[PDB]
Design a protein around this ligand. Structure first.
Ligand SMILES: *Cc1c(COP(=O)(O)O)cnc(C)c1O
Ligand SMILES: *Cc1c(COP(=O)(O)O)cnc(C)c1O
Lengths: 396, 396
């Protein structure tokens, strides 16, 4: 049965882990996957998380199955975090949230739900964008079309090209937006642009799908959700795939959510029943630990305060590394200006390297990055910064 | 987009949870889902599990992503538990295991892997059987055919009908077997029958797929795997979807595994790369907590000893309830003999009620069971046994 199976192509992002494994050189620098590192180059468990796990260890009395949609408190807290404490969507009961195994899992559930219960045939994703998006939607049998987004020469959001590109999108099509911290450009729409996009979306009849994996990494928790809330204020229907992998440092516990929004309570409930059916034939019910940690923290004033501060510190360290990176490049002799990286929100640096330069950095300097030229700024520390820049200056 | 979505049909098993929720009557007895209960009617966290979680809370230093296939130690321990400490499959490196979100998740990964990378068109499942099997395989685009298995009149495995039924199965077809504790009959093949089935399977050219969710609940950990090992000794290829939900009481942490076996190391690796691709576009990587607990326990002699004893106690309590159930039915006036339930392995009791009787038990007595007439013996306690039997005697 398996004699003719062909080897699968390596994943451009997740595949870096395997290459790093094989490389036995001592000075390897991992700037591939979007994972936060502290000044010591480690990816620690948040303190607020440790305290939540301590609490669970002492008060948890059973591991009995959660409902198909997960922990109810988790859903409410996720909705508040997304739409705002007193949002009308929450009051009118127009939203239903299902706990999922990570943001990627949320995207899969959304894709299966769409393919089987709606007339959606196309999903529009940005270019440049996150490769996993095409893979997930394609695996569900939906076609992916790309829309322009980045002005590679000026390092800004090419709004005109974006609008012009989406005009080929027909009503009933799904258009995917990154809530904040666009992966990989790091350039997000301004509030006014978000408002124009929401407006346009309503007229064209698109079904907006927001991938929200970095809430809190651009400017703040509430600020990062203004784009989404702008859309939520005008749309009757929408979908949100969010993740707690990064803002909680719960990467391997797979904590995400898929939120469905309909015109009214009656409609979202009927639709959500089908979303639950898509989960039922996938993994049945979600893993409790990670989501439990998130629910516990967001529900406890004390823990939540500690957590928000830790998030703030993470965002701030990355912002400081961007300056140090740019500065160190200038005093190391870089024959090019990489100051535009200061405007980029999120964990990454993008737009200054070719795939060959990335390949040379790996083979000759042991510096690992995505072939697209995306480097994880969150992986830079005061210790690896010097050798990292020396390697870069050597390939420019 | 969602105006015309139709409400989804309730799940015959998972749907009981919602009905129980709505029923406000005080004396409700939940005998639906297969979850273990102790004498007090609670589903506790195993002591060995609590100790493992204590250990993780103190030694875990990061929540960084696991590889697509999960924790490596978890895979090795799962293989040893399945094939035996010094199995040839392990020595020859013919097996690859991917940690999955539960046994159901394992089945989904196997189904997606099969549909996309092989010529498999049909999957054969038993009748009676577990409804979720058809749902999962059908959702992947594979057709499900049923094979006879139970002698409803004698309450035994109808081997002749089984063989005769599978003769319509062509080479290249997938045939699904329950490793032990057949759900819901509780009647498993004898070692000799397993050997005849393995033999037959090799000649017909079937691809065996074992659903192993109750290892340790029939007779013991090693004994329950003899059927599987019988097949593993003669087949070049096979698939195993196992679960730790029950034998570890880790239901909501979603701990399962999908093991792939090929003729040689070279072939399993190539095939496994495609299985990883199927996971990549689903949930990306598995939840660490649950599998970590399992790896920790199976790797620590002390913890493992405690765990094996707890498993032994669970199997023993269920066995004692079967006797008490049968006895209490006789002294309560049952006009029928339910002694055949003593031979049934696992958590359930099956074969003595009609769907109407089950419906009446619910509506009039607040006793909840699956419409198929399957009751969770593991849910019976010395306290609810009397009223439970009184209700049953009233509907016979
Ligand atoms: C990190 C990320 C996700 C979700 O990650 P999970 O690990 O699955 O929670 C989704 N979309 C983008 C663009 C991301 O960068
Ligand atoms: C319980 C069970 C499973 C797996 O359950 P999970 O909760 O997904 O781990 C698989 N097959 C059968 C027949 C089962 O009874």
């Amino acid at each position: 049965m398996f004699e003719n199976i062909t080897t699968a192509p390596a994943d451009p992002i997740l595949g870096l882990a395997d290459l790093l494994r094989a490389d036995e050189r001592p000075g390897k620098i991992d700037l591939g996957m979007g994972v936060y590192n502290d000044e010591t180059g480690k990816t620690p468990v948040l303190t607020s998380v440790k305290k939540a796990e301590q609490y669970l260890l002492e008060n948890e009395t059973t591991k009995n199955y959660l409902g198909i949609d997960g922990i109810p408190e988790f859903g409410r807290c996720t909705q508040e975090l997304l739409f705002g404490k007193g949002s009308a969507l929450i009051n009118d009961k127009r939203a239903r949230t299902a706990q999922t195994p990570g943001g990627t899992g949320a995207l899969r559930v959304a894709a299966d739900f769409l393919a089987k219960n709606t007339s959606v045939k196309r999903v529009w994703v940005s270019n440049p964008g996150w490769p996993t998006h095409k893979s997930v939607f394609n695996s569900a049998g939906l076609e992916v079309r790309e829309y322009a987004y980045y002005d590679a020469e000026n390092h800004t959001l090419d709004f005109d090209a974006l609008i012009n590109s989406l005009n080929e999108a027909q009503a009933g099509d799904v258009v995917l937006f990154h809530g904040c911290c666009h992966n990989p450009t790091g350039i997000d729409p301004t509030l006014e642009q978000w408002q124009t996009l929401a407006q346009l979306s309503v007229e064209k009849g698109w079904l907006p799908l927001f991938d929200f994996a970095y809430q809190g990494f651009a400017r703040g928790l509430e600020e990062d959700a203004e784009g989404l809330r702008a859309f939520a204020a005008m749309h009757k229907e929408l979908i949100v795939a969010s993740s707690y992998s990064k803002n909680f440092g719960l990467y391997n516990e797979r904590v995400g959510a898929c939120t469905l929004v309909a015109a009214d309570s009656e409609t979202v409930d009927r639709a959500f029943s089908q979303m639950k059916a898509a989960i039922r034939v996938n993994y049945s019910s979600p893993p409790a630990h990670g989501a439990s940690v998130v629910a516990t923290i967001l529900s406890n004033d004390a823990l939540r305060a500690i957590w928000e501060q830790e998030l703030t510190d993470m965002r701030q360290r990355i912002q400081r590394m961007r300056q140090l990176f740019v500065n160190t490049l200038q005093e190391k002799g870089a024959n090019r200006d990489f100051s535009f990286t200061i405007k980029q929100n999120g964990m990454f640096f993008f737009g200054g390297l070719t795939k060959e330069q990335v390949l040379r950095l790996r083979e000759e300097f042991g510096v690992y990055a995505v072939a697209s030229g995306r480097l994880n700024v969150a992986g830079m520390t005061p210790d690896n910064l010097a050798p990292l820049c020396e390697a870069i200056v050597a390939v420019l």
